[PDB]
């Protein structure tokens, strides 16, 4: 038993809800919140900008120190950093950005990072300003992640289409 509330159960291990990940994170304090990161951990907009703003820019300060030491992530890769006031940990995961021409096949590799964590609150990778089809992203998530994933979908209209077209 865990503290996630109001989710619709899609499969044995995937759950979905219409929620603002920032507000869901502040209420659950999950062990892991996933950020839709870029390779530079520049958290300017989308989910990343919203998560970082919620931390009062502490996420960005920590991220800049990480990059200065380690260099950029790989597309499809991840790193674990602090969850600040939102979660124990933040798993920064880089899905391919279609608006940069990155291969969408890397979306499966991105979701594989979730399997290193027993339970996660997460957005749909490569959705939103990353330009991929959120329905494809949900399909890859379901077919790749084996651990327990609670997906937060900000847009109510999108969620309803996601739930309604799910196979
Ligand atoms: F201010 C915001 C902006 C975006 C989100 C937010 C608060 N909260 C969210 N909770 C879940 N999913 C989200 N998004 C929505 C747009 O499409 C995807 C994306 N994520 N990053 N770029 N695009 C996923 C958001």
Secondary structure of the chain: what % helix, strand, coil (to 5)?
40, 20, 40
Does ligand 1 have an atom closer than 6 angstroms to the CB of 130? yes
Handedness of CA 124, 125, 129, 131 (dihedral sign): negative
Domains contained in the chain, CATH given:
8-163 (3.40.220.10)
Does ligand 1 have an atom closer than 6 angstroms to the CB of 134? no
Does ligand 1 have an atom closer than 6 angstroms to the CB of 41? no
Going by their DSSP bridges, the two strands 32-36 and 78-82 should be labelled as: unpaired
Query: Alpha helices, DSSP H only, in the chain?
Result: 21-28, 46-54, 58-70, 106-112, 134-144, 156-164
How far is residue 151's CA from residue 154's CA, in Å, rounded to a whole number? 10
Does ligand 1 have an atom closer than 6 angstroms to the CB of 154? yes
Which burial class, exposed, middle or buried, applies to 167 when counting CB atoms under 10 A from its CB (0-12, 13-18, 19+)? exposed
Q: Which tokens is 16 given?
A: 């979905």
Dmax over Cα atoms in the chain, in whole Å?
45
Spatial contact of 96 and 103, defined as CB atoms under 8 Å apart: yes
3-state secondary structure of 129: helix
Q: Which of 8, 17, 47, 64 is nearest to 125 (CA)?
A: 47
3-state secondary structure of 121: strand
Q: Which of 68, 81, 136, 83 is nearest to 108 (CA)?
A: 136
How far is residue 21's CA from residue 140's CA, in Å, rounded to a whole number? 20
Q: Which of 144, 138, 113 is nearest to 17 (CA)?
A: 138
Residue among 154, 155, 159 to mutate when testing ligand 1 (max atoms within 8 A of CB): 154
Spatial contact of 130 and 46, defined as CB atoms under 8 Å apart: yes
């Amino acid at each position: 038993v865990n503290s996630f509330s109001g989710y619709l159960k899609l499969t044995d291990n995937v759950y979905i809800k219409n929620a603002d990940i920032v507000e869901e994170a502040k209420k659950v304090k999950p062990t892991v919140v996933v950020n839709a990161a870029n390779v530079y951990l520049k958290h300017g907009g989308g989910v990343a900008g919203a998560l970082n703003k919620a931390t009062n820019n502490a996420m960005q300060v920590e991220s800049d120190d990480y990059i200065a030491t380690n260099g950029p992530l790989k597309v499809g890769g991840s790193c674990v950093l602090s969850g600040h006031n939102l979660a124990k940990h933040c798993l920064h995961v880089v899905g391919p950005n279609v608006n940069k021409g990155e291969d969408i096949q890397l979306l499966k590799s991105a979701y594989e990072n979730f399997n290193q964590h027993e339970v996660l609150l997460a957005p749909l990778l490569s959705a939103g300003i990353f330009g991929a089809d959120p329905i494809h992203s949900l399909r890859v998530c379901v077919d790749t992640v084996r651990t327990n994933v609670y997906l937060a979908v900000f847009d109510k209209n999108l969620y309803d289409k996601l739930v309604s077209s799910f196979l």
